[PDB]
Structure formats: C-alpha cells, structure tokens
Write a protein that binds this ligand. Structure first.
Ligand SMILES: COc1ccc2c(c1)N(C(=O)OC(C)C)[C@@H](CSC)C(=S)N2
Lengths: 430, 556
C-alpha cells in the first residue's frame, strides 16, 4: 500500500541529545481535536506510536486557522531546531533573496503539506516524538513519533529544498522577475505588479503547484475591517519609519519643556551626541509647572538641530549575520502598540507602530499575538530569521492564551518584561 | 510467572558498557538465605544461572526489612542505573482528586509483584548478572541472569506501566465505561455497576491478568472503599486528607518549621481559609536544619488561627462534567488571597490560596488578576475547562487597570460579587499639571559609605525645608523627600521628582507594604485631592538642581 523512496541522513549537533521538553497542559475540546487529527494521520502512515525506549519530546497545540471549522496541529519544534537546525543552517541552508524586501507585493502560501510525503530517517525519527495530553493526568500519554517529514521542523524544507527548486522551475522562468523565498512551510512570493495583476500571478503559481504534484496551497478567505480578501499581501514598499511624534505645540509652558527635555535625553545614547543645553537653562529655575513660558533666543538652535537630526540616522542599520534580532514590544494604548527590532541594544534595525481599532475587540492578548505574528512575517521578508521577543506580559497568562489567536505556522523564541519602561511615552524606538 | 507480552528493547548510553563488580564475600547463613530464594526463583523462571563467558556482576543485600517471617533479598542496581539509557517518565504527575468523577462503585487491585512477571528483552539480561560465592570457596561462579524486570532498575516502572497499558487494552476495548487507572502497584478500577455486577467485572479482570501472566491475589476485590492514595483520603463519593496532625513545641529548629509550613500548605486544598504567610516569613535564615528559631507571636497568631479551621474536619465533592464550574476569590489581607471553586453552590470541590511574595509594591487589583491566572491555569490542568469567575472587583476599577497598566492582562468570564473588603482603586494621579497649586521641587541624597541622608524640598514661592536622616538608603531617602513634600501641601499639589525609581514606584499606585515609609506616602495620596507627579533627570541640572542639590549637600 506504499511507495518507499530514499533518505538524507540527519544527525545531531556537536555532541548533543534530543529535546526532552514537556507538554504544556491542554484544554479538552483541543485534546479531542488533536486525536481527531492524529488518528486519521496515524492511518495515513505519517506518524506512529512509540514505547518507553524513546524518552524525547516536543509540544503539540491546536489552532483554528483562518476561520472556525477545523483545527490545525502545531508543534513547538523550537528546541529541535535549536538542536539539529543550527548545523543545517549550514550543511543544508536555504539562502535569503535580499530583494524580497523591495518587491512591491509579497504573498504567503501554506506549502507545508508538501513534506508529508518525504520519508524521515529510521535512525533519527525518535527525536520528533510528541505526546498528546490527557485531562487531569488520568491516563498515560498518547505517544507518537514522526515517520515522514514534520511540518513544524526547520530541518524539513531544507530536505525538500531539492524537490522544491525542481517543481517551481517552469514558473520562475515563465515569470522571471518574481522573487520566491521558502521559509519553513511558507512560500513568500514577491513582484512589482499592482493588486489585480499580482493576485492572479499567484493563482497561477497555485495551479502550477497543484498540477506538478500534490503540493497544495490551502484556500485563503476571511473578512475583517482590513481587506483580507485574496491573499496575505504584504507591501514592502511602505516600509518607512517615523514613530517619534515630537509635540509641535509643546514648548509653550514649563511642564511641556520638562517633557521635551526628557524624551530628548534618551535620543542621547541612541543618537550619539545631542545639544539640549540652551533649552534646559530656560527652566533651570524652580518655577511653577503651568507657567506659560516663552523660549530663549539660543534655544531654537537646540530644538531644530535635533528636530532635523530626527530626520536622518547613520550607523545603526548594520545587520550582523552571526548575531540575532531582538524584538521588543510595548503597549501604548487602545489599539496601538510599538515595536523595535535591534540586535545589539540601542542600534535600531527597524521600528514601527502596530495598531487596530478602539471600537474593536480592544483585547490585550489578541493584539499582542497578532502583533507578534506581524513583527515576524516582516522579519522573514527582511532578515530571514525570527527575532527573540521581549514581551510586555505575564509569563503565565501568555502561556495560557497565545495558542488561541495564533493563526500561524512557526513559533518564535520568547521572553517577558519584569519592569515598567519609560519607553511607552508617546512612542519610542529603544 | 513470566508473561508472554511483547517485551521492550533497552540499551546503555553509547560509549558505555554494563557494570562489573564482585561483592563482599558472605558466610554460611547469609548465603543460605540467598540460595533458597534464588534456586526457586529460577524454577519460576524469573532468573537463570548462566555461568562462564559473562564478565559482568552486581551485589546482593540479604535485607530482611523490618523483621519478616520469610527471608527476602534485594539486589542494588546503583551502577547499572547510571549506564542504562533514558526512559520516558511515567510519573507525569498525579490525577488530582478534585477532577475525579463519581464512578459509583470502585476497587483497587494489588499489582505489587507484577514487575517480576513482565519480561526483559533477551539481549539486556546479561547486564543484570549477579554472583554469590560459597563459604568454602569450593564451587564459585554461582551466577544468575535476570529474565524479568528487576527491582529498582530505571526502566522497570517505565516498561511495566507500558506493558500493562497494552494488557488492559483488549479488556478496556471489549468493555468500556468500566474505567481503569494505574500507579506503581495499584489498580483503581471503578464503574456505575451494582456491586455484584461490579464484582463480576473485577473477577473478569483478575482472570485476564492471570491469563496474561501477572498473578493478582486480591481475593475477590479484596480492598475496601476508604482509600489512602498519596496522602489523599478517598471515599466513593467525596474526598479530603485524613491524618494531618500538626503538633506544637516550645523551641523548634528550621528542620521542623519546614514540615510545619508543609502540612498547612497541603491542607489548603480542602479546608476553606488558611494562610502560611507568617510561619514562613521568618524562614529567611536558610541555615542548617538544627538552628532554632524563636517563632514570632504573629506566627502563633496564625498557627492557632489555622488550628481551628483545621480541627473540625472538611469534606470534598467530585466533578460533574455537565454542571458548571464557577470560582470565587476572597481577600484575606497581608497580600494573601483565597479561592473556592463550585458547581452546585456552597459545597466545595477545591479550595486553595494565592499570595504574592519576594517582590513588593504590587497592586491589589494586580494581585487579584495574578491569582485568577493561578486558577485559570489549575483549572485546565485538572477539569479541562475554565471556571466562570466570581470576583470582588468593580468593572469600572478593572478596565482602569487594563487600559492603564503597562503590561497586558486578560481574565475570562467573570462576575461581580459583594463582600465588605471590595477590591478597587484608593487613588489615582493626574495627567495634566495642576493650576495654581504649589510646585514642590523635591530632592534627596545620602552617603554611599557614610550612610546619613538628608530629605527636603523647595517650593515655587520660596518655601524651603530639609529633614536630615540617618540609617536611610539613597532609595529610601528619595522616597522620604516626597512624603515630606506631601505633608506640607494643602489639598491639590504638584511634585517634580529627582528619582525615576520613586517615580515608577508611585506611578503604579500600590497600597500595601511593610515599609511604613511607602505606606505613609500611600496614606497621603489617599486623603489628598489632586496629586501630580512630575520627573526630571538627576546629574543633569534639570529643573532646579543648581540650588536644589546645593542645599542638601553632605560633607564628603
Ligand atoms: C475511593 O476511590 C476513588 C473515588 C473517586 C474517583 C477515583 C477513586 N479515581 C482514581 O483515579 O483513584 C485515585 C488513585 C486517583 C477515578 C477512577 S478510580 C477507577 C474517578 S473518575 N473518581
């Protein structure tokens, strides 16, 4: 009933062992959804049960992708990558086409089902074992192991890479200017064509992807206030940045100036060397806050210097490939959030203000997850690596609620904030 | 009585090899206590005496534990335990009683020596070799080899809890709803069958087992309804912990206060209302378990306040998947919260307490929402759902600590209760600077090595002051300076701060602390009308530092 092919020997990183992470306790409907999934899949020869001689592990979640009807399985393969894929970031790495970031319209298709065909190594499979949880620790785990290529794993598209180049060939030349990037189970596609023209260029690739095998890009549809009609069209052309909204109407009083001296004093270790003195001496006295005080003659030379230096940075943008991006988000209000993608503290590689409606759900843990997803697809298109997040949230709250509004394939590494920053003043690029 | 079940493949970590020793040569009687047991253990096929060609070994303790009537041994696999591979942990926890269902009739079957029945893979058996030499040294080389899972041995409980999950499998399939559970040497079978009909399913089981190899002499379900499961006292329709007798002394060491803080803790599952704060508060001295600590009077005040609720017993209900799950939380003061969880009103399912520690200045609204989580987490871990919350907090003071807090929070379905100790905001600072109100520039300084501070302020209308301090940290002092500054203002005030620390500590608008210093600022804030807290950087002449830190100047 089968069709046996050939295997690429996968082995372990510098004297390492397999991940022995632990399965975070799961809801009920979800544990039901996971067995609904894993059993048909067991029939499909994809996965299979193991015994005690395999002590490894990896988290399993359940997500309702796009719109409510059926659940998707997710595997926090974050540790195995950390194990195996940092040697397969070399031996078998997928190069990042650094022009994807310039191409007017990027789209993402879920080409993750294409791997479930490729068999995985008889000797390696143990490290992909995952366990399905039980309510109230009654029964011992439903313990599976992967036969084929795991759709989560970062070392899967690396294997299928060979096959992916061969299958996309006809398209890449019939459509030359199109830049295609393969990150995980995703296929990022980018052109210089306008909406109408690019949207079909993608259907083209879809059908091409259909015919040429059973690789299939899952149907896309939904309708949120923001146009989510066709595809997940990112527009790398609008990548411009100026969150720092310096108050034009604020240097009227003493308090305004006290604020104006504070924001600026951060732009000191960010923008090496700034002149603020002639302004500060204007409130050198112990005066009343609401005192509507005019600025001094030599003061404008401090405001407008920095006010024009707030129009052109210098060294910052330098991406070291032997180091990694760190994304830090900070809440700003009812809908808007602000992020900072650096790599070595204070040197901003990219900043922006995530937002959404005030008349919407206005839910904190909805926006945070939908912002985490954004910060990241952006960093794929740009750096080809997922950032380490510095989250403004309770460790234990996130662990509960993330897997709910997480309509996404990959899972970036994370961290949570212990202290209250002064960075969420009006907007601030740390 | 070897079983004919699919055995499991065990290996030793690569690079290694099985252990090899030679034990402390024993004499006449002790060997007579081993030859008897071993040469009838081989008859039952658990071991096998393979002589030459096997180079390994292990020792034999002839341990008649307690003082048994029949001699018993125990082979210490300490060295093998290191060499063998890693197994998947069976002990993935404990099914907590609160999430158990009312399975009418229940029984427990003793699968105690059901380890020696399951077989060990045919290749690993050699690494379990052990030898026993004679007194006279006449016929040495008396060495067996283990056929089944030996005692202790890393993989034993692993392989067993897996072999027996395959054994019960056809039974469980044929006849479901007759729910099975298993832990080490127990079989907790129970259903909704009228005793005799339940007494059949048990004997059915007891014979399936006897057919699969593992004998179970639990003479016709020989185990009574009241159970001692890992401390838990179990009755066929409710639960609690039975023995929980915490004595008192007159001069106890830390060694004994830790057991004390233990029991009171455990008892927190059922007994509505309990706090182990002050009993642990003094445990700071993580010294030796021999040093005596003269318990504070506030710890007895609590130890006794516990002993009452603890004396007169409390009962525990089971779960009903159809009946709601609703929990409520009461403020028990001192940054200590307590919660109870119910389906059918009043009668309790599970109770427990939350209490923030090691990191003060925390908000009550915040301390509330932290507790809720602790619960929302404990729910999913047990029942598989989330409790509809019943909370002592006004919506208009909550959404003001959702829309006002930096970190992001999230509490599911929750509804308003009514209890005298309401959780809400006692105060709140201004956003725009106040008009007319006196502007107090605050300053504070101290010694990095002379430890003698100076507090004080200056006002927009030439109104100075300085209150010298001693044994006060720079941090405390910057804090003391604002309090000072608070005291000398009318109804509405403005305060420009030196410190970011003090700023960011008064911004979060806390309430409780042991530091009378911060508690005293709090009290000023609560009675004041409109408070505004500004901020300017130190070491940069911002504000009025020129003359402001020229007055609070020390001699160094
Ligand atoms: C007095 O014994 C009991 C009363 C109520 C229950 C149990 C035991 N339960 C159990 O696992 O026992 C311990 C080891 C956790 C389970 C299944 S027992 C077939 C259930 S659903 N309710």
């Amino acid at each position: 009933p089968i069709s046996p092919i050939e295997t690429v020997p996968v082995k372990l990183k510098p004297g390492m062992d397999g991940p022995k992470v632990k399965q975070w306790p799961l809801t009920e409907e979800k544990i039901k959804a996971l067995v609904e999934i894993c059993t048909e899949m067991e029939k499909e020869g994809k996965i299979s049960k193991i015994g005690p001689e395999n002590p490894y592990n990896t988290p399993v979640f359940a997500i309702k992708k796009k719109d409510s009807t059926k659940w998707r399985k997710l595997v926090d393969f974050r540790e195995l990558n950390k194990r195996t894929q940092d040697f397969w970031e070399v031996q078998l790495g997928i190069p990042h086409p650094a022009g994807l970031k310039k191409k007017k319209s990027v789209t993402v298709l879920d080409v993750g089902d294409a791997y479930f065909s490729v068999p995985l190594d008889e000797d390696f499979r143990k490290y992909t074992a995952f366990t399905i949880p039980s309510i109230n620790n009654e029964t011992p785990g439903i313990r599976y192991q992967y036969n084929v290529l795991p759709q989560g794993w970062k070392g899967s598209p690396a294997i299928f890479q060979s096959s992916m180049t061969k299958i996309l060939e006809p398209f890449k030349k019939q459509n030359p200017d199109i830049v295609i990037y393969q990150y995980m189970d995703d296929l990022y596609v980018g052109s210089d064509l306008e909406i109408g023209q690019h949207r079909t260029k993608i259907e083209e690739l879809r059908q091409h992807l259909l015919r040429w095998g059973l690789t299939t890009p899952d149907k896309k549809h939904q309708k949120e206030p923001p146009f989510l009609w066709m595809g997940y069209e990112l527009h790398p052309d609008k990548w411009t940045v100026q969150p720092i909204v310096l108050p034009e109407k604020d240097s009227w009083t003493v308090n305004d100036i006290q604020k104006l001296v504070g924001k600026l004093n951060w732009a000191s270790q960010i923008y090496p060397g700034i002149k603020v003195r002639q302004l500060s001496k204007l409130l050198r006295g112990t005066k009343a806050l609401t005192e509507v005080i005019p600025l001094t003659e030599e003061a404008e030379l401090e405001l407008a210097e920095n006010r024009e230096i707030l129009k052109e940075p210098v060294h910052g943008v330098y991406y070291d490939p032997s180091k990694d991006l760190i994304a830090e988000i900070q809440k700003q209000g009812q809908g808007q959030w602000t992020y900072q993608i650096y790599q070595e503290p204070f040197k901003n590689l990219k900043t922006g203000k995530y937002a959404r409606m005030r008349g919407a759900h206005t839910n904190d843990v909805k926006q945070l997850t939908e912002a985490v997803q954004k910060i990241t697809t952006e960093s794929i298109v740009i750096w080809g690596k997922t950032p380490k997040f510095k989250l403004p949230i309770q460790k234990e709250t996130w662990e509960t609620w993330w897997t709910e509004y997480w309509q996404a394939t990959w899972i970036p590494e994370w961290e949570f904030v212990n202290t209250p920053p002064l960075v969420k003043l009006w907007y601030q690029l740390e | 009585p070897i079983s004919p079940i699919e055995t499991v493949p065990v290996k030793l970590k690569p690079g290694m090899d099985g252990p090899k020793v030679k034990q402390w040569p024993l004499t006449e009687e002790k060997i007579k206590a081993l030859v008897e047991i071993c040469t009838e253990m081989e008859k039952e096929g658990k071991i096998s005496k393979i002589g030459p060609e096997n180079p390994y070994n292990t020792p034999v303790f002839a341990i008649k534990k307690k003082d048994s009537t029949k001699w018993r041994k125990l082979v210490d696999f300490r060295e093998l335990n290191k060499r063998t591979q890693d197994f998947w942990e069976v002990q993935l926890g404990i099914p907590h009683p609160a999430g158990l269902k009312k399975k009418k009739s229940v029984t427990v079957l003793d699968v105690g020596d059901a380890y020696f029945s399951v077989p060990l893979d045919e290749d690993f058996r050699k690494y379990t070799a052990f030898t026993i030499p004679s007194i006279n040294n006449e016929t040495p080389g008396i060495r067996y080899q283990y056929n089944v899972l030996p005692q202790g041995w890393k993989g034993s409980p692993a392989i067993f809890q897996s072999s027996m999950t395959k054994i019960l499998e056809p039974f469980k399939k044929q006849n479901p709803d007759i729910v099975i559970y298993q832990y080490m040497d127990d079989l907790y079978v129970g259903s909704d069958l009228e005793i005799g009909q339940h007494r059949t399913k048990i004997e059915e089981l007891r014979q399936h087992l006897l057919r699969w190899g593992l004998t179970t002499p639990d003479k016709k379900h020989q185990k009574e309804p009241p159970f001692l499961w890992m401390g838990y006292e179990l009755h066929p329709d409710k639960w609690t912990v039975q023995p929980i007798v915490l004595p008192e002394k007159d001069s106890w060491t830390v060694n004994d206060i830790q057991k004390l803080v233990g029991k009171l803790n455990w008892a927190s599952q059922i007994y509505p209302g309990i706090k182990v704060r002050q009993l642990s508060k003094l445990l700071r001295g993580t010294k030796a378990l021999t040093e005596v600590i003269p318990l504070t009077e506030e710890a007895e005040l609590e130890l006794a306040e516990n002993r009452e609720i603890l004396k007169e017993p409390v009962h525990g209900v089971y779960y009903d998947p159809s009946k709601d799950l609703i929990a409520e939380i009461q403020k028990q003061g001192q940054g200590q919260w307590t919660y109870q969880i119910y389906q059918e009103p009043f009668k309790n399912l599970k109770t427990g307490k939350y209490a923030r520690m090691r990191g003060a200045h925390t908000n009550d609204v915040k301390q509330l929402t932290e507790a809720v989580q602790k619960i929302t987490t404990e729910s999913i871990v047990i029942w598989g759902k989330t409790p509809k919350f019943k909370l002592p907090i006004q919506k208009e003071t909550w959404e003001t600590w959702w829309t006002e807090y930096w970190q992001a929070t999230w509490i599911p379905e929750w509804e308003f209760v009514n209890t005298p100790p309401l959780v809400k905001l006692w105060y709140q600072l201004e956003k725009e600077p106040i008009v007319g109100a006196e502007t107090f520039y605050v300053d504070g300084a101290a010694n990095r090595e002379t430890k003698l501070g100076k507090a004080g302020y200056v006002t927009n209308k030439g109104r100075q002051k300085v209150v010298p301090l001693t044994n006060t940290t720079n941090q405390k002092t910057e804090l003391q300076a604002i309090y000072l500054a608070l005291q000398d203002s009318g109804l509405e005030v403005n305060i420009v701060t030196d410190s970011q620390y003090a700023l960011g500590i008064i911004q979060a608008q806390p309430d409780k602390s042991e530091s009378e210093l911060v508690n005293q600022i709090i009290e000023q804030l609560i009675k004041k009308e409109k408070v505004y807290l500004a901020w300017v950087p130190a070491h940069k002449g911002i504000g009025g530092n020129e003359q402001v830190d020229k007055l609070v100047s020390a001699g160094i």
